[PDB]
Design an enzyme around this catalytic site. Structure first.
Site, PDB file in Angstrom:
ATOM      1  N   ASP A 214       0.768  -1.221   0.000  1.00 50.32           N
ATOM      2  CA  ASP A 214       0.000   0.000   0.000  1.00 50.32           C
ATOM      3  C   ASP A 214       0.815   1.295   0.000  1.00 50.32           C
ATOM      4  O   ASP A 214       1.288   1.777   1.013  1.00 50.32           O
ATOM      5  CB  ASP A 214      -0.835  -0.042   1.267  1.00 50.32           C
ATOM      6  CG  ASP A 214      -1.897   1.007   1.265  1.00 50.32           C
ATOM      7  OD1 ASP A 214      -1.876   1.857   0.316  1.00 50.32           O
ATOM      8  OD2 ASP A 214      -2.768   0.975   2.181  1.00 50.32           O
ATOM      9  N   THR A 215       0.855   1.884  -1.224  1.00 50.52           N
ATOM     10  CA  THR A 215       1.624   3.110  -1.366  1.00 50.52           C
ATOM     11  C   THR A 215       1.021   4.295  -0.625  1.00 50.52           C
ATOM     12  O   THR A 215       1.678   5.327  -0.392  1.00 50.52           O
ATOM     13  CB  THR A 215       1.791   3.478  -2.856  1.00 50.52           C
ATOM     14  OG1 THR A 215       0.515   3.626  -3.451  1.00 50.52           O
ATOM     15  CG2 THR A 215       2.505   2.373  -3.638  1.00 50.52           C
ATOM     16  N   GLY A 216      -0.265   4.160  -0.235  1.00 48.71           N
ATOM     17  CA  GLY A 216      -0.866   5.241   0.529  1.00 48.71           C
ATOM     18  C   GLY A 216      -0.664   5.106   2.028  1.00 48.71           C
ATOM     19  O   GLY A 216      -1.164   5.953   2.778  1.00 48.71           O
TER      20      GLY A 216
HETATM   21  C1  LIG Z   1       0.648   5.486   9.699  1.00 49.25           C
HETATM   22  O1  LIG Z   1       0.442   4.386   8.825  1.00 49.25           O
HETATM   23  C2  LIG Z   1      -0.825   4.250   8.360  1.00 49.25           C
HETATM   24  C3  LIG Z   1      -1.823   5.191   8.553  1.00 49.25           C
HETATM   25  C4  LIG Z   1      -3.053   5.003   7.896  1.00 49.25           C
HETATM   26  C5  LIG Z   1      -3.217   3.986   6.991  1.00 49.25           C
HETATM   27  S1  LIG Z   1      -4.737   3.847   6.111  1.00 49.25           S
HETATM   28  O2  LIG Z   1      -5.143   2.434   6.042  1.00 49.25           O
HETATM   29  O3  LIG Z   1      -5.743   4.754   6.715  1.00 49.25           O
HETATM   30  N1  LIG Z   1      -4.468   4.445   4.605  1.00 49.25           N
HETATM   31  C6  LIG Z   1      -3.909   5.765   4.540  1.00 49.25           C
HETATM   32  C7  LIG Z   1      -4.268   6.465   3.202  1.00 49.25           C
HETATM   33  C8  LIG Z   1      -5.738   6.906   3.264  1.00 49.25           C
HETATM   34  C9  LIG Z   1      -5.704   8.361   3.740  1.00 49.25           C
HETATM   35  C10 LIG Z   1      -4.258   8.756   3.453  1.00 49.25           C
HETATM   36  O4  LIG Z   1      -3.837   9.911   3.461  1.00 49.25           O
HETATM   37  N2  LIG Z   1      -3.498   7.720   3.170  1.00 49.25           N
HETATM   38  C11 LIG Z   1      -3.981   3.505   3.621  1.00 49.25           C
HETATM   39  C12 LIG Z   1      -5.040   3.328   2.500  1.00 49.25           C
HETATM   40  O5  LIG Z   1      -4.413   2.699   1.343  1.00 49.25           O
HETATM   41  C13 LIG Z   1      -6.196   2.419   2.924  1.00 49.25           C
HETATM   42  C14 LIG Z   1      -5.889   0.968   3.270  1.00 49.25           C
HETATM   43  C15 LIG Z   1      -7.159   0.212   3.704  1.00 49.25           C
HETATM   44  C16 LIG Z   1      -7.723   0.443   4.936  1.00 49.25           C
HETATM   45  C17 LIG Z   1      -8.919  -0.159   5.347  1.00 49.25           C
HETATM   46  C18 LIG Z   1      -9.616  -0.986   4.460  1.00 49.25           C
HETATM   47  C19 LIG Z   1      -9.027  -1.232   3.227  1.00 49.25           C
HETATM   48  C20 LIG Z   1      -7.767  -0.733   2.868  1.00 49.25           C
HETATM   49  N3  LIG Z   1      -7.218   2.491   1.865  1.00 49.25           N
HETATM   50  C21 LIG Z   1      -8.337   3.216   1.960  1.00 49.25           C
HETATM   51  O6  LIG Z   1      -8.619   3.997   2.874  1.00 49.25           O
HETATM   52  O7  LIG Z   1      -9.153   3.041   0.915  1.00 49.25           O
HETATM   53  C22 LIG Z   1     -10.470   3.575   0.997  1.00 49.25           C
HETATM   54  C23 LIG Z   1     -11.326   2.707   1.914  1.00 49.25           C
HETATM   55  C24 LIG Z   1     -12.122   1.742   1.055  1.00 49.25           C
HETATM   56  C25 LIG Z   1     -11.749   0.274   1.190  1.00 49.25           C
HETATM   57  C26 LIG Z   1     -10.486   0.165   0.338  1.00 49.25           C
HETATM   58  O8  LIG Z   1     -10.681   1.101  -0.719  1.00 49.25           O
HETATM   59  C27 LIG Z   1     -11.723   2.027  -0.391  1.00 49.25           C
HETATM   60  C28 LIG Z   1     -11.163   3.453  -0.398  1.00 49.25           C
HETATM   61  C29 LIG Z   1      -2.222   3.031   6.799  1.00 49.25           C
HETATM   62  C30 LIG Z   1      -1.033   3.183   7.495  1.00 49.25           C
END
Ligand SMILES: COc1ccc(S(=O)(=O)N(C[C@H]2CCC(=O)N2)C[C@@H](O)[C@H](Cc2ccccc2)NC(=O)O[C@@H]2C[C@@H]3CCO[C@@H]3C2)cc1
Lengths: 99, 99
Positions: free
Chosen positions: B25-27
């Site tokens: 996960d690049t995000g």
């Molecule tokens: C400090 O390290 C972390 C902090 C937060 C996250 S995160 O999971 O909240 N997120 C951060 C992203 C979102 C906000 C930002 O600035 N960066 C990683 C995301 O890739 C996350 C990873 C993720 C988290 C929870 C469920 C699924 C994937 N995906 C996500 O939020 O996707 C949204 C939710 C919906 C489900 C998946 O796709 C749909 C769109 C990960 C590590």
């Protein structure tokens, strides 16, 4: 380009005729912006992230200019703290992870 | 490998000696797992994303193996809905996003 990941991978996109910045997020299924104006009708959708659910507006078949390509597809709008480009968009420009 | 993004980019990962899977996960700034048990003490940390915030357990100096690359890294443990490999770990195996 080849993007290393030492810093957050942001890209410039044009959406709604405006230049915006968004995070390339391979863990996001969907592309989500805050504060933009899309064409056409929208439908309500909920998305579940790491902390809980987020209410958004779903706009289908709208254009995003990204990496020099016109991508037409779904864009979500809601009060996300960071605009994100998800896999729905990235697959249309042939993005890959390489390791 | 070179993977596309039509499906979620899960990889097999060995973390603390346990075989698991997680999203590249690049995000994600950091690596977060929900279904592992790491030994000893931990520091509390707060993290945030779509939908809100969570308290996680920071475990230091943890062995991680992905695609044959063995690294030593920080792993967060907490109630994430899906395990993610963040940029901290991806930089250590030389992963890049390309388009
Ligand atoms: C400090 O390290 C972390 C902090 C937060 C996250 S995160 O999971 O909240 N997120 C951060 C992203 C979102 C906000 C930002 O600035 N960066 C990683 C995301 O890739 C996350 C990873 C993720 C988290 C929870 C469920 C699924 C994937 N995906 C996500 O939020 O996707 C949204 C939710 C919906 C489900 C998946 O796709 C749909 C769109 C990960 C590590």
């Amino acid at each position: 380009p080849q993007i290393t990941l030492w810093k957050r991978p942001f890209v410039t996109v044009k959406v709604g005729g405006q230049l915006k910045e968004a995070l390339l997020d391979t863990g996001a299924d969907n592309t989500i912006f805050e504060d933009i104006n899309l064409p056409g009708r929208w439908k309500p959708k909920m998305v579940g992230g790491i902390g809980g659910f987020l209410k958004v507006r779903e706009y289908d078949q709208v254009p995003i200019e990204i990496a020099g390509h016109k991508v037409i597809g779904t864009v979500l709008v809601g009060p996300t703290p960071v605009n994100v480009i998800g896999r729905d968009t990235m697959t249309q420009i042939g993005a890959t992870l390489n390791f």
